[PDB]
Design a protein around this ligand. Structure first.
Ligand SMILES: *[C@@H]1O[C@H](CO)[C@@H](O[C@@H]2O[C@H](CO)[C@@H](O)[C@H](O)[C@H]2NC(C)=O)[C@H](O)[C@H]1NC(C)=O
Ligand SMILES: *[C@@H]1O[C@H](CO)[C@@H](O)[C@H](O)[C@H]1NC(C)=O
Ligand SMILES: *[C@@H]1O[C@H](CO)[C@@H](O)[C@H](O)[C@H]1NC(C)=O
Ligand SMILES: *[C@@H]1O[C@H](CO)[C@@H](O)[C@H](O)[C@H]1NC(C)=O
Lengths: 49, 50
């Protein structure tokens, strides 16, 4: 107990509910904020970004 | 990234054509209290790494 790396849930749902169009709340990957998603197709991200 | 037990004479032995000696850089055969463990990859034909 309280030693190791096998932890518990302790957190939120992580729901795939990307609700574009409306002003929302977010905590994306550690960064918190409020915004409006607007889906686009882009190709500049690399596989660790 | 764990709590191993390093040696006074710790050394590595290659796997292609290994040396005369045995690779013995630590003897900690009791799966110590690890804080981290990961597996990564790279190019097998690269010359430089950073
Ligand atoms: C990361 O890769 C290493 C390299 O294969 C893995 O270590 C092997 O573990 C098995 C199972 O105990 C042994 O039979 C092999 O001899 C180990 N290889 C070496 C080079 O020591 C390791 O298990 C991998 N870890 C993860 C999390 O994938
Ligand atoms: C305003 O409402 C309409 C329909 O309810 C919606 O299509 C539009 O995106 C909304 N505007 C904003 C900025 O959310
Ligand atoms: C290296 O390890 C093997 C396997 O335990 C052992 O038989 C051998 O004696 C070791 N080498 C030396 C020089 O002791
Ligand atoms: C990287 O790996 C690929 C395939 O494994 C190979 O074709 C390429 O030559 C390698 N590049 C370098 C710089 O080693």
């Amino acid at each position: 107990i309280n030693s190791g790396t096998t932890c518990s849930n302790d957190l939120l749902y992580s729901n795939t509910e990307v609700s574009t169009g409306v002003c929302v709340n977010y905590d994306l990957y550690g960064i918190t904020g409020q915004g409006i998603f607007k889906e686009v197709s882009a190709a500049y991200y690399n596989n660790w970004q | 990234a764990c709590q191993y037990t390093m040696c006074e004479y710790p050394h590595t032995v290659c796997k292609s054509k290994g040396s005369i000696r045995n690779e013995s850089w630590h003897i900690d055969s009791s799966e110590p209290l690890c804080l981290f463990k990961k597996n990564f990859t790279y190019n097998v034909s690269a010359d430089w790494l950073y």
